[PDB]
Amino acid sequence: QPLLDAVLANIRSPVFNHSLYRTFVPAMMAIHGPPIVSPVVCSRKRRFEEDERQSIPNVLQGEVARLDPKFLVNLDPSHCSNNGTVHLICKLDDKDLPSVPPLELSVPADYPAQSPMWIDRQWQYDANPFLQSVHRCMTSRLLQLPDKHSVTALLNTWAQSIHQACL
Amino acid sequence: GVNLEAFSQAISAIQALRSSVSRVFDCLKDGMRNKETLEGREKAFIANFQDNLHSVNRDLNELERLSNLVGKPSENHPLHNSGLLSLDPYSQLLQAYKWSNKLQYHAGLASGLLNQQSLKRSANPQYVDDVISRIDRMFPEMSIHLSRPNGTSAMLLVTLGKVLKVIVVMRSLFIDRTIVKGYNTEDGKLDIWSKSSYQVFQKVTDHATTALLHYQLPQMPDVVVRSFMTWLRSYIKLFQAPCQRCGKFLQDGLPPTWRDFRTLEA
């Protein structure tokens, strides 16, 4: 109901801001009498330096941390400074039969995409009969993942397919 | 006599009104600090004004409470303050009252907190049963009576509002072996093992057995029986069923969490 102050403060468009001070500060300083209402001292040069200048996209680092001791990823001759940021060599060292490591070059780690690279498909999979069956079912299974994720999801799918087509 | 809560709420509302006026007139003492696109201070101004209006409305609503201040000038408190001037040389009585209230509340909270005690394990009287039964029967709408027909076994019987009486047997402590039966009973001249029902009180008997096996405390069986009785008292309505509909099945009841809902949903 007492919209008078509201409409006046809204009408007060001009740039000069000293009327509110001279109009209110006397009354408040008379009633409230703090010589230092905020006696804490504040003199701050906030930012000195904040950069490691050696970090790859941190989101990928989280996944490489969450990886199981069975998996292990690395880096090849890397076109992966900051944008691609990955084309790894993940050897699925586990209890069952081993295989050939894929590249899995992923996009920016924000991940509005997935990894799959499929580089060494040409000679590695056609050469062996078992490796040929490994690729077969694994492609069909990867054509099912809705928006797969780079390290954990794709690596686990690869291991599961490798140890499932093994039969 | 719940006027204390209303008075505390009114005190808080007045303090909030004062603080809101102070905040409004302290923020109005400062213009737009740094906008660089559009003065967003009008939003904070409108918010503070709406907060003042909210506090005024809260005070007006609390005005509806606090019906009347009764007489009884402090309820027999004046004995030496308003009494003889010799008697009040008096603050000892008020100090004792406040200290007793604080001690009671603090001990209650401490017990409720330390209920989860770190006791590793326990290693290194047919007279109080009637008293405990009477103390439990002192509750309203819980008319019970024990018979003890065979030996020291307390073959008591309960009935709250309906004809759904429960012949809950006992063993002079940690009462067990309960059987619920509705709308007629006691055949011959004693209790029975009938357990007959309409496929509904069978679930009630199962729940009661689960409860009897659930409230097994290491000591203090009186508190155990009191908790058992206040747990059983929740079966006086049978008109609620959260997480489902009212008639998901024939029956609906399992309140171990003091909220009965449809069975087969826990």
Add this chain to the structure above:
Amino acid sequence: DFDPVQRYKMLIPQLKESLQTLMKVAAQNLIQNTNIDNGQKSSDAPLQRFDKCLEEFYALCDQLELCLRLAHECLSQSCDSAKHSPTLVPSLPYPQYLAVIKAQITCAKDIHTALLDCANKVT
């Protein structure tokens, strides 16, 4: 010589009216100061102080808070002692009441002193 509830009911609407007049005088003083400091002379009329209003509003708020605090303390100290003794004043004699109160205070003080001494002797 009215009841605290009556004082509260008679103070609340005066409080609302004081708040309204406070907002009005604040708006008038602010618009006058702006017209006298930003634009042309238009408000050539004596305005109020806006301080003699806010001081009175704060006084009314504080007095209402004090009345409600007194009522709360009265009801609290009357409730806890009502559940500790029967009513007997012009069902019990006054000397017996005084002796019972003295014994109660003595027993509570003894319990507190024993507990404090034991807690101090524990360490």
Add this chain to the structure above:
Amino acid sequence: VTCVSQMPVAEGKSLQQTVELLTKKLEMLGAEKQGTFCVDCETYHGKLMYVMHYPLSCFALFENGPCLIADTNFDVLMVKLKGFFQSAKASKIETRGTRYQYCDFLVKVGTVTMGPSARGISVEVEYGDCWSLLLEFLQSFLGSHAPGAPTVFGNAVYGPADTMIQYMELFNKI
């Protein structure tokens, strides 16, 4: 409890067709068969009769009825009470049907007593006043139903004769 009976006048296919449809819906609900509990209540004069299953023909004529006479007690009493009541001209008929028991429940279909009548549904409850569960189960059975009118403002304590009073009211209503 004591759930009153209604008189849903179904049409379109047939009365027997509607009865069969209701029975099919009840069977789809998951209710087994529990014998044919044909209820029978014949009016007389303002006397009445009752054969609701139970070897006790308890004619609740008026004043809430005694509902205690045996299956042959009230019958022999009325047979011996010749000349006292001379209003036997207006006869009265009775329905029949099946009786299912889903779980702590019962359903009874009231067919054509003398031939003109609707399919009178009737149900019961487990303990007893406690209409939330009754309505929640009735709504899942059909649509427009549940007139009500129980012995309200009584506390009786789950009056068993209330079913007989509802049956008499329904028979007088049609």
